């Protein structure tokens, strides 16, 4: 298992384009991947789950992954978030 805590910086939080790209990026990896905010946890490859989570700008989330590529799956998401989704 690999886990990281990270702040969401972009205006939209995990909604619309960023959310789609987030799931897109997570879906590149074989690991099971999760996104947690305040005790609620969802599959990072699930757009309905991401939506349910209601992650807005400034929110700190925990990303976790378990699988053969868990470390680089998390890194890919960390990098996507820190770059504000390619901005």
From TrEMBL:
Keyword ATP-binding set for record: no
Major site of localization recorded for this protein: cytoplasm
Compartment list: Cytoplasm
Origin superkingdom: Bacteria
Keywords noted in UniProt: Cytoplasm, Phosphotransferase system
Residues in HPr domain copies: 1-87
GO cellular component, one term: cytoplasm
Matching Pfam families: PTS-HPr
CDD domains listed in its UniProt record: PTS-HPr_like
GO biological process per UniProt: phosphoenolpyruvate-dependent sugar phosphotransferase system
Keyword Transcription (UniProt): no
Summary of the function given for this chain in its UniProt record: General (non sugar-specific) component of the phosphoenolpyruvate-dependent sugar phosphotransferase system (sugar PTS). This major carbohydrate active-transport system catalyzes the phosphorylation of incoming sugar substrates concomitantly with their translocation across the cell membrane. The phosphoryl group from phosphoenolpyruvate (PEP) is transferred to the phosphoryl carrier protein HPr by enzyme I. Phospho-HPr then transfers it to the PTS EIIA domain.
Record-given protein name: Phosphocarrier protein HPr
Source organism of this protein record: Caldanaerobacter subterraneus subsp. tengcongensis (strain DSM 15242 / JCM 11007 / NBRC 100824 / MB4)
Gene: FruB
């Amino acid at each position: 298992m690999k886990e990281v805590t990270i702040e969401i910086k972009n205006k939209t939080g995990l909604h619309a384009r960023p959310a789609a790209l987030f799931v897109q990026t997570a879906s590149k990896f074989s690991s099971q991947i999760w996104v947690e905010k305040d005790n609620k946890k969802v599959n990072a490859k699930s757009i309905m789950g991401i939506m349910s989570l209601g992650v807005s700008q400034g929110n700190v989330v925990k990303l976790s992954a378990e699988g053969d590529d868990e470390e680089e799956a998390i890194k890919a998401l960390v990098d996507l978030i820190e770059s504000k989704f390619g901005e």
